[PDB]
Curated annotation (Swiss-Prot):
The gene is rplA. GO terms for molecular function: rRNA binding; structural constituent of ribosome; tRNA binding. InterPro entries: Ribosom_uL1_bac-type, Ribosomal_uL1, Ribosomal_uL1-like, Ribosomal_uL1/biogenesis, Ribosomal_uL1_3-a/b-sand, Ribosomal_uL1_CS. PANTHER family: 54S RIBOSOMAL PROTEIN L1, MITOCHONDRIAL, LARGE RIBOSOMAL SUBUNIT PROTEIN UL1M. Part of the 50S ribosomal subunit. This is Large ribosomal subunit protein uL1. Keywords: Repressor, Ribonucleoprotein, Ribosomal protein, RNA-binding, rRNA-binding, Translation regulation, tRNA-binding. One of its GO terms (biological process) is regulation of translation. Belongs to the universal ribosomal protein uL1 family. One of its GO terms (cellular component) is large ribosomal subunit. The L1 stalk is quite mobile in the ribosome, and is involved in E site tRNA release. Binds directly to 23S rRNA. Protein L1 is also a translational repressor protein, it controls the translation of the L11 operon by binding to its mRNA. The keyword RNA-binding applies.
Length: 224
């Protein structure tokens, strides 16, 4: 038990406006560190149909682009590729000890498939909860590491539905000022609607939610 007080602040049968949720969500993220805020949606698509799949990018108005300090962990000539692409910090596995000793001045981590065993094994504990672990479908692990770095630097994050017909993406951290959070949430919804597939029939956004790492979900009105 660590949530009776957390359950009293949210009405489960209420559809909140994006601004109310933006303010409310900050009070649900009363946990350690800076909690990642995500928007989740149930889409009106047939997930087994390739012509009804949703994949795209959203340029969020706050938090991304240049200002993001990217740490790239790689091996061989991939370190050179990462340097050429402009990652803020680049290192081989030797840099894991630096993070272990308390170094943490980066906002995002990208890595090549070959350093992941050691990365996930030595840092899954620290980075995992903070939402900083490179992950194949978060698009932060791949051999085309120069491309990954340039995308984030450009301020774009990718999204795609999963096999259950759900989709989601991080839109900020709990500490963000509510108006910035609200701006980012609206930006993701606008991007998502512009990606409604041709033949999708019926309601596209069946229900939309805002949530933190390990908190209750808040249902929101996508058109507020
Ligand atoms: Hg996720």
């Amino acid at each position: 038990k660590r949530y009776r007080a957390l359950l009293e602040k949210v009405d489960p049968n209420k559809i909140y406006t994006i601004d109310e949720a933006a303010h409310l969500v900050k009070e649900l993220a009363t946990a350690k560190f800076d909690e990642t805020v995500e928007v989740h949606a149930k889409l009106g698509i047939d997930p087994r149909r390739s012509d009804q799949n949703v994949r795209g990018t959203v340029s969020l108005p706050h938090g991304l682009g240049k200002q993001v300090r990217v740490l790239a962990i790689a091996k061989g000539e991939k370190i050179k590729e990462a340097e050429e692409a402009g990652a803020d910090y680049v290192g081989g596995e030797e840099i894991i000890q630096k993070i272990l000793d308390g170094w943490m001045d980066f906002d995002a981590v990208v890595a090549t498939p070959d350093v992941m065993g050691a990365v996930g094994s030595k840092l899954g504990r620290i980075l995992g909860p903070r939402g900083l672990l490179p992950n194949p479908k978060a698009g932060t692990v791949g051999f085309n590491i120069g491309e990954i770095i340039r995308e984030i630097k450009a301020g774009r994050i990718e999204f795609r539905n999963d096999k259950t017909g759900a989709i989601h993406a991080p839109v900020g951290k709990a500490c963000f000022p509510p108006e910035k959070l609200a701006d980012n949430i609206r930006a993701f919804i606008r991007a998502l609607e512009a990606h409604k597939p041709e033949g999708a029939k019926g309601t596209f956004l069946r229900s939309v939610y805002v949530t933190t790492t390990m908190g209750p979900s808040v249902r929101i009105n996508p058109h507020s």
